[PDB]
Amino acid sequence: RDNIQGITKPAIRRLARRGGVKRISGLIYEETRGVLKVFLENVIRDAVTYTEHAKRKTVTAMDVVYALKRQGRTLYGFGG
Amino acid sequence: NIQGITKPAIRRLARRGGVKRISGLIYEETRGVLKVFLENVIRDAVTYTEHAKRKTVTAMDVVYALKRQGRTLYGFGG
Amino acid sequence: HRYRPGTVALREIRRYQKSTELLIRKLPFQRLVREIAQDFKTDLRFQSSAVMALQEACEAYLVGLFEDTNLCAIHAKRVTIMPKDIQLARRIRGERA
Amino acid sequence: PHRYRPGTVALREIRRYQKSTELLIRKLPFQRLVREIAQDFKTDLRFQSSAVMALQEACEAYLVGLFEDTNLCAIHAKRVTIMPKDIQLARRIRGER
Amino acid sequence: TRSSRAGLQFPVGRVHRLLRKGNYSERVGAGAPVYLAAVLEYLTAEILELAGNAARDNKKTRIIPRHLQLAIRNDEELNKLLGRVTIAQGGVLPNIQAVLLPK
Amino acid sequence: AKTRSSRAGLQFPVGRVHRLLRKGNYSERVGAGAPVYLAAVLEYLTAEILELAGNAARDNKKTRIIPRHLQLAIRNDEELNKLLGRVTIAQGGVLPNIQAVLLPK
Amino acid sequence: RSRKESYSIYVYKVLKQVHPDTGISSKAMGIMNSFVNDIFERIAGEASRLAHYNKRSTITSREIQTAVRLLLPGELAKHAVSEGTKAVTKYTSAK
Amino acid sequence: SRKESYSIYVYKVLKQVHPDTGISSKAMGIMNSFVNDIFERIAGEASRLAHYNKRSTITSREIQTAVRLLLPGELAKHAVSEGTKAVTKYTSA
DNA sequence: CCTTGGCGGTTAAAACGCGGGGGACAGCGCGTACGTGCGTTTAAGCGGTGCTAGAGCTGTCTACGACCAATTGAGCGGCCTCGGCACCGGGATTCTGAT
DNA sequence: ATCAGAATCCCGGTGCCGAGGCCGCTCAATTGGTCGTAGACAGCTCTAGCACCGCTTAAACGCACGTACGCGCTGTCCCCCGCGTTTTAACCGCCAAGG
Numbered sequence: 001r002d003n004i005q006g007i008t009k010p011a012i013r014r015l016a017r018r019g020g021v022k023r024i025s026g027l028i029y030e031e032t033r034g035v036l037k038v039f040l041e042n043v044i045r046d047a048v049t050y051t052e053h054a055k056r057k058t059v060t061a062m063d064v065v066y067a068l069k070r071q072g073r074t075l076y077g078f079g080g
Numbered sequence: 081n082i083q084g085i086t087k088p089a090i091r092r093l094a095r096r097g098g099v100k101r102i103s104g105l106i107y108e109e110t111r112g113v114l115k116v117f118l119e120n121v122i123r124d125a126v127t128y129t130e131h132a133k134r135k136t137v138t139a140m141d142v143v144y145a146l147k148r149q150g151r152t153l154y155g156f157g158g
Numbered sequence: 159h160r161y162r163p164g165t166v167a168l169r170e171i172r173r174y175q176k177s178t179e180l181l182i183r184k185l186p187f188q189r190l191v192r193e194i195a196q197d198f199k200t201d202l203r204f205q206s207s208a209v210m211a212l213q214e215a216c217e218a219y220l221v222g223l224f225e226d227t228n229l230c231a232i233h234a235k236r237v238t239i240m241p242k243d244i245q246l247a248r249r250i251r252g253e254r255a
Numbered sequence: 256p257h258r259y260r261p262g263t264v265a266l267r268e269i270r271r272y273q274k275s276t277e278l279l280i281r282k283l284p285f286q287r288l289v290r291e292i293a294q295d296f297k298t299d300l301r302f303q304s305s306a307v308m309a310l311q312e313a314c315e316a317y318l319v320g321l322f323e324d325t326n327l328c329a330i331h332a333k334r335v336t337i338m339p340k341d342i343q344l345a346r347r348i349r350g351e352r
Numbered sequence: 353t354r355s356s357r358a359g360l361q362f363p364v365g366r367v368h369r370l371l372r373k374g375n376y377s378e379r380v381g382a383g384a385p386v387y388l389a390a391v392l393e394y395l396t397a398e399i400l401e402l403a404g405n406a407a408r409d410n411k412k413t414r415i416i417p418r419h420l421q422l423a424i425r426n427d428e429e430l431n432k433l434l435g436r437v438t439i440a441q442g443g444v445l446p447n448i449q450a451v452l453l454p455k
Numbered sequence: 456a457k458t459r460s461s462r463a464g465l466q467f468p469v470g471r472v473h474r475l476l477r478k479g480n481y482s483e484r485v486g487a488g489a490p491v492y493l494a495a496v497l498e499y500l501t502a503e504i505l506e507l508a509g510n511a512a513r514d515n516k517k518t519r520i521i522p523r524h525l526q527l528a529i530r531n532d533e534e535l536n537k538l539l540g541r542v543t544i545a546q547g548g549v550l551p552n553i554q555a556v557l558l559p560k
Numbered sequence: 561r562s563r564k565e566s567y568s569i570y571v572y573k574v575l576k577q578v579h580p581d582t583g584i585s586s587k588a589m590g591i592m593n594s595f596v597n598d599i600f601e602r603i604a605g606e607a608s609r610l611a612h613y614n615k616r617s618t619i620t621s622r623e624i625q626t627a628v629r630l631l632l633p634g635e636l637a638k639h640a641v642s643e644g645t646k647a648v649t650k651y652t653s654a655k
Numbered sequence: 656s657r658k659e660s661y662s663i664y665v666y667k668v669l670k671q672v673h674p675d676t677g678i679s680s681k682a683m684g685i686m687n688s689f690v691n692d693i694f695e696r697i698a699g700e701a702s703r704l705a706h707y708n709k710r711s712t713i714t715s716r717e718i719q720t721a722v723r724l725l726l727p728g729e730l731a732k733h734a735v736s737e738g739t740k741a742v743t744k745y746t747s748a
Numbered sequence: 749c750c751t752t753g754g755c756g757g758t759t760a761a762a763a764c765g766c767g768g769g770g771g772a773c774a775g776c777g778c779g780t781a782c783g784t785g786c787g788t789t790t791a792a793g794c795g796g797t798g799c800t801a802g803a804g805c806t807g808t809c810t811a812c813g814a815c816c817a818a819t820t821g822a823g824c825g826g827c828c829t830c831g832g833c834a835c836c837g838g839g840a841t842t843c844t845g846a847t
Numbered sequence: 848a849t850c851a852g853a854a855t856c857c858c859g860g861t862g863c864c865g866a867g868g869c870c871g872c873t874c875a876a877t878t879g880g881t882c883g884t885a886g887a888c889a890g891c892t893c894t895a896g897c898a899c900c901g902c903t904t905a906a907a908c909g910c911a912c913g914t915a916c917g918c919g920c921t922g923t924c925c926c927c928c929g930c931g932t933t934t935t936a937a938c939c940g941c942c943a944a945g946g
């Protein structure tokens with residue numbers, strides 16, 4: 001519960017600064033939280049499918065990396 | 081040459097997407113982007129033809145070049 | 159008589175919304191495609207369905223880019239599209255590095 | 256110890272956080288969100304440290320890219336501040352929901 | 353024949369032959385071609401029924417590619433699936449934004 | 456020369472690539488010249504990435520290569536950024552990109 | 561001579577079950593054939609990569625099922641898994 | 656367990672390129688994942704080309720046209736030249 | 749027995765003059781939204797503890813897929829028919845500019 | 848609003864052609880067997896994920912705070928568009944070829 005708000009407002013501030021935002025609005029945080037939640041839902045579902053087919057109930061690093069690979073946001077350094 | 085994509089052709093292409101007012105410098109940017117896209121797709125198709133050892137580009141080659149570009153098209157028995 | 163600007167374009171948009179025929183005529187786009195291809199080979203030819211597929215793909219890509227450009231202009235509180243709008247659409251698309 | 260007009264402090268934070276590379280989204284709240292999301296789907300889920308770190312870094316990269324696209328949309332619109340409509344347009348052009 | 357032994361128009365022999373020629377693994381299970389054929393049959397069936405819906409929207413019985421593309425674009429799921437995929441003689445939905453309507 | 460790697464004069468192992476292709480489920484039979492060409496292509500791509508990674512490192516005067524250098528090298532070069540615009544490097548960040556109007560006036 | 565294969569008859573049949581009073585242009589029939597081939601090869605490639613990562617060289621019904629779970633959207637994935645499981649059971653039950 | 660990696664080959668390549676430069680283990684994993692992804696992409700594209708062309712075997716022309724297709728013109732040309740030089744070096748002796 | 753174009757003939761399309769007025773274009777009220785700080789309120793994370801089934805590998809057998817050769821019936825090759833949807837033209841819907 | 852005046856929504860007609868009717872053909876999908884291995888079942892093993900608090904410390908919290916770039920409101924100036932207009936040349940027919 002309330003984990004969607006777990007990403008604090010200053011954390012989103014730092015994310016924006018890395019992105020390159022100078023002026024940040026107050027409703028940006030909620031939309032960013034929604035985008036993060038949707039992307040996490042997709043990647044987690046893909047990784048869960050990967051680990052279920054393996055008959056392993058533990059989500060492994062290779063499962064998540066392969067899920068990111070299939071989603072078009074392939075991430076490196078973690079096997080797969 | 082590049083005038084083959086005519087002013088009315090660019091007008092119709094823009095109006096298909098819902099554009100209302102078009103500037104005089106839009107034609108140059110549109111023709112440049114279309115030239116880049118055509119160069120890429122025709123490059124892929126000609127590379128397919130070179131691989132095929134044939135003399136003429138086939139419809140399958142164009143469709144699969146589009147697919148490799150991520151622009152798959154239906155209607156041609158791909 | 160002389161109408162006010164703006165309504166006509168909406169009328170042809172509504173009418174052409176019911177048709178799917180290819181916009182660009184055959185021979186000029188044909189010549190453009192073949193002169194671009196001449197930079198890759200000499201005396202090279204395409205297939206008929208290959209040419210039609212190239213026309214469909216070019217029309218679809220250009221229409222998508224124009225929709226992106228119009229959306230960028232409207233979101234920029236503008237109605238007439240400018241090449242900078244196309245540049246923004248290309249940059250967000252990721253093609254331009 | 257000073258407060259300036261809006262932006263120089265923003266520029267300082269931007270310089271600091273572009274000079275820094277460590278994770279901006281904190282690991283514990285992000286992992287808690289991941290576990291909350293995964294609870295609704297499947298029970299008895301164990302996550303590896305590298306898996307959660309991969310989730311965190313991929314999400315950070317996607318968010319930063321979306322922020323870059325939003326900044327491009329705003330600046331192209333002659334605007335400094337970003338609005339939810341800016342993010343809507345950026346995601347519309349990007350194509351990931 | 354194995355066409356109707358799986359209760360599908362698409363035969364098992366053709367699909368299993370395609371699987372064997374694709375070398376998708378060392379060996380293909382018995383239910384894999386049947387699974388694929390059933391999924392394909394349902395997908396083409398729903399595509400064609402939304403095509404018929406588009407056809408009756410256009411007041412025409414015979415399916416034209418315009419009907420197919422309207423079927424693709426009305427449904428949110430299919431537009432999500434075949435959004436990057438274009439159709440020859442396809443078109444797009446009736447889409448009018450209210451911002452540009454005259455006063 | 457006993458191993459085929461010495462005959463080909465490359466660095467990447469031909470044997471492990473051949474084993475992976477065998478356990479690859481993409482082809483029944485593999486030619487005798489494809490592995491060498493693929494190894495050369497992979498080596499050239501790795502060298503292309505590593506040259507710009509070292510360029511960034513020497514710009515930063517850092518011997519060890521952190522993922523920040525990899526991401527900066529991938530994003531800076533037009534060819535790699537166009538090629539790998541959809542590719543994400545862990546702990547990489549993004550380029551320092553300041554627009555003209557972003558600087559205070 | 562070349563005897564190229566086509567899914568014309570099966571696609572015509574399927575449209576006839578879903579719409580008897582509905583003709584289909586050869587363009588639409590080709591579109592349906594292309595869609596069928598695309599989806600089949602998509603699920604086949606997903607199963608191939610699942611067999612790759614799982615260190616198992618056998619594609620049973622489980623591999624295609626998880627491929628469909630990964631490929632098709634949630635509600636569509638659920639429907640396809642249900643129908644494919646029913647098809648697999650009825651295929652295994654009989655001769 | 657018996658999990659192979661390409662760390663030593665990357666180290667040797669770095670030594671032959673930069674004799675006095677190191678790299679991190681995280682960057683090593685990033686390079687390993689990049690190699691895996693590019694290998695998967697190349698294998699899939701070769702598979703699709705072979706299935707279209709009805710070829711039961713793979714030759715150098717397939718991978719050459721693959722390099723031409725995927726990489727841009729200059730990078731594709733350089734990679735093709737390097738691979739052809741390697742093939743000629745192996746075949747000549 | 750194929751694909752641009754050789755081009756005849758087309759007939760409506762390329763190319764463009766051009767007005768006018770509403771939009772491009774910047775300027776500027778204005779002031780509510782809100783950087784920046786920054787203490788208050790929050791609880792991060794970094795290093796720990798044993799819990800402890802289960803990832804992974806090995807066993808493992810045997811159910812289940814591959815291999816062989818006969819098979820056998822539908823898969824897609826050949827020509828012909830004829831009304832849905834496009835066209836030729838009228839008539840009536842459904843709009844909207846000037847009013 | 849108010850009808851004008853074209854302009855779009857659906858129509859009877861209409862005629863020569865896209866889909867789809869009739870019947871083979873014909874080899875590959877189908878048959879059962881017999882090989883034959885891999886993987887799910889069974890069990891194995893210790894590793895880093897686990898429950899949990901528990902303190903730290905960089906960081907999160909709240910709205911008072913400046914305040915500037917945002918948006919009310921408009922002039923600006925004009926870039927273009929509506930339409931006719933005339934020239935453009937691509938297209939309906941015509942079969943190509945070559946291996």
